Amino acid sequence: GIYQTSNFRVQPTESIVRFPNITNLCPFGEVFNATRFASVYAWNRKRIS
Amino acid sequence: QVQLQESGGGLVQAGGSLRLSCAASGSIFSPNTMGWFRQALGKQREMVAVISSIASTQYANFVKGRFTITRDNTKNTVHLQMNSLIPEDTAVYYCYAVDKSQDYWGQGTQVTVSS
Ligand SMILES: *[C@@H]1O[C@H](CO)[C@@H](O)[C@H](O)[C@H]1NC(C)=O
Ligand SMILES: *[C@@H]1O[C@H](CO)[C@@H](O)[C@H](O)[C@H]1NC(C)=O
């Protein structure tokens, strides 16, 4: 006759996580590496998005 | 990179007149607030006049009644009308632009009056 012994399944090989990096670099060098910095009363805030 | 061009210095005898100027060629966020600073060799920076583009005068008492400044809103240029020069008031002058984002300084102009 024909008998069913066990069940077979394929196991995942490697786990992969990805979120979208998709963007531009980011305006940081112009802040930290800037040649000159603003005074403590004419305040320079740069927007980052 | 907002750049200010300073010119109008030189050597003038006692009682003469000098015409300084600084121009703002940058983006200039919002209405700005022009200014000027006087620093003698070996002293701090003594501001002369920091008139806003609108009002408030803001004139120091060091040279009261002698120095006046004009505004040209067409090109946002600045001119200084210096009169009755005295050797005590001779020093290095720097144009100051407050702006909205950050404030800048000129390269320096030399004013020397003696007799
Ligand atoms: C995101 O991808 C771009 C090009 O695809 C790359 O220049 C950038 O460095 C990447 N960001 C990170 C954080 O690796
Ligand atoms: C600033 O620039 C220098 C040379 O271009 C670089 O070595 C340094 O990493 C920069 N600063 C930052 C925070 O990346």
PDB file of N, CA and C in Angstrom, chain A residues 36 38-39 42-44, chain B residues 96 98 100-103:
ATOM      1  N   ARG A  36      31.857  79.728   7.546  1.00  0.00           N
ATOM      2  CA  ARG A  36      31.454  80.725   8.524  1.00  0.00           C
ATOM      3  C   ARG A  36      30.148  80.309   9.184  1.00  0.00           C
ATOM      4  N   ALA A  38      26.801  81.753  11.721  1.00  0.00           N
ATOM      5  CA  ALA A  38      26.055  82.960  12.032  1.00  0.00           C
ATOM      6  C   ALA A  38      26.315  83.405  13.468  1.00  0.00           C
ATOM      7  N   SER A  39      25.938  84.649  13.753  1.00  0.00           N
ATOM      8  CA  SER A  39      26.043  85.173  15.105  1.00  0.00           C
ATOM      9  C   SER A  39      25.011  84.500  16.006  1.00  0.00           C
ATOM     10  N   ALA A  42      21.513  86.714  15.031  1.00  0.00           N
ATOM     11  CA  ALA A  42      20.992  86.519  13.679  1.00  0.00           C
ATOM     12  C   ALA A  42      21.141  85.030  13.388  1.00  0.00           C
ATOM     13  N   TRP A  43      20.144  84.255  13.807  1.00  0.00           N
ATOM     14  CA  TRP A  43      20.288  82.811  13.927  1.00  0.00           C
ATOM     15  C   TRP A  43      20.051  82.117  12.590  1.00  0.00           C
ATOM     16  N   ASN A  44      20.968  81.215  12.229  1.00  0.00           N
ATOM     17  CA  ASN A  44      20.925  80.476  10.969  1.00  0.00           C
ATOM     18  C   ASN A  44      20.429  79.056  11.224  1.00  0.00           C
TER      19      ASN A  44
ATOM     20  N   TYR B  96      27.850  95.816   7.775  1.00  0.00           N
ATOM     21  CA  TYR B  96      27.181  94.715   8.454  1.00  0.00           C
ATOM     22  C   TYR B  96      25.767  94.564   7.911  1.00  0.00           C
ATOM     23  N   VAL B  98      22.349  92.354   8.559  1.00  0.00           N
ATOM     24  CA  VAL B  98      21.687  91.437   9.482  1.00  0.00           C
ATOM     25  C   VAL B  98      21.026  90.292   8.723  1.00  0.00           C
ATOM     26  N   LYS B 100      17.990  87.774   7.248  1.00  0.00           N
ATOM     27  CA  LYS B 100      17.084  86.920   8.008  1.00  0.00           C
ATOM     28  C   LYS B 100      17.719  85.609   8.434  1.00  0.00           C
ATOM     29  N   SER B 101      18.544  85.006   7.579  1.00  0.00           N
ATOM     30  CA  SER B 101      19.186  83.735   7.896  1.00  0.00           C
ATOM     31  C   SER B 101      20.450  83.931   8.732  1.00  0.00           C
ATOM     32  N   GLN B 102      21.409  84.701   8.220  1.00  0.00           N
ATOM     33  CA  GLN B 102      22.684  84.872   8.902  1.00  0.00           C
ATOM     34  C   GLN B 102      23.263  86.236   8.552  1.00  0.00           C
ATOM     35  N   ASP B 103      24.233  86.674   9.352  1.00  0.00           N
ATOM     36  CA  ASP B 103      24.836  87.989   9.192  1.00  0.00           C
ATOM     37  C   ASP B 103      26.273  87.866   8.698  1.00  0.00           C
TER      38      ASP B 103
END
